[PDB]
Ligand binder design. Structure first.
Ligand SMILES: Nc1ncnc2c1ncn2[C@@H]1O[C@H](CSCC[C@H](N)C(=O)O)[C@@H](O)[C@H]1O
Ligand SMILES: [Ca+2]
Ligand SMILES: [Zn+2]
Length: 251
């Protein structure tokens, strides 16, 4: 039900419904969803936790931990075709909210990497509270959620990472406020992940809006199928309006 073409000229976009679906959601294509349930459960979890997310750090803009909201995640699970056989990596996982929802909706193994020691601790403690609640509410056992406290560059420096997954790999990179050197580093490293891997980014790893891009970087076009999207209105914490993001699929 997505509008547009997925090109720079006509990115894929999904207007909000005027009226809610059966589950109260204005965002999802499906008539039923879990977005409000996750909205409410996450808020109760973080409210009960004694340790709180550090959303911003004055002086270190790259540490900003504002969230992709549950409505964004429900759409992302569909757009990136996340299955139970996939492994989902949130590079910069913040409070872990994305991991918790992807695990619940897909059954995929979920790995978060976070440089903030405090927010990594928030994420780990929140998973211990929310997992039983998800499991009791749904009657299903949850997949594994592992939180790594590290600069992601130290983890990704291992060329063997991702390789055993045979492309059953989904990577989220919420890098709007990452330093350009980090996004550039990631763009080099992701050229070498296996075929089938799907990568979502906001500051584009492989800029492709200009006609000359395929002449400037033909390798990028040989290695990736590129699709442009607009995030839905009111689907990201830091902005009520829409904006661009990109999914790169390794050919
Ligand atoms: N080099 C690095 N290694 C690991 N995490 C990093 C990092 N540089 C920035 N980050 C983290 O990346 C996060 C981006 S905010 C994204 C939060 C979550 N993934 C969501 O989308 O809702 C921040 O928490 C910040 O601390
Ligand atoms: Ca490789
Ligand atoms: Zn929904």
């Amino acid at each position: 039900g997505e509008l547009g073409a997925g090109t720079p000229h006509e990115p894929y976009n999904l207007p909000l419904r005027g009226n809610p679906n059966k589950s109260g959601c204005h965002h999802c294509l499906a008539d039923q969803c879990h977005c409000v349930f996750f909205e409410r459960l996450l808020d109760a979890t973080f409210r009960r936790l004694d340790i709180k997310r550090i959303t911003e750090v004055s002086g270190s803009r790259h540490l900003c931990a504002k969230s992709l909201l549950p409505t964004f995640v429900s759409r992302m699970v569909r757009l990136m075709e996340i299955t139970s056989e996939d492994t989902f990596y949130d590079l910069g996982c913040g409070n872990g909210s994305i991991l918790f929802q992807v695990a619940f909706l897909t059954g995929a193994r979920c790995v978060g990497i976070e440089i903030s020691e405090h927010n990594a601790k928030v994420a780990k403690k929140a998973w211990e509270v929310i997992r039983p609640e998800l499991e009791g509410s749904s009657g299903r056992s949850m997949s594994e959620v592992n939180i790594i406290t590290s600069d992601m560059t130290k983890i990704l420096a291992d060329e063997r990472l991702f390789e055993s997954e045979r492309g059953k790999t989904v990577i989220l990179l919420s890098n709007l406020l990452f330093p350009k050197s980090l996004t550039h580093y990631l763009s080099e490293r992701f050229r070498r992940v296996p075929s089938g891997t799907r990568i979502l980014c906001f500051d584009d790893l492989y800029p492709h809006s200009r006609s000359v891009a395929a002449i400037r970087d033909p390798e990028a076009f040989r290695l990736f199928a590129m699709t442009d999207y607009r995030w839905q209105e009111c689907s990201v914490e830091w902005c009520t309006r829409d904006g661009p993001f990109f999914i790169h699929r390794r050919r």
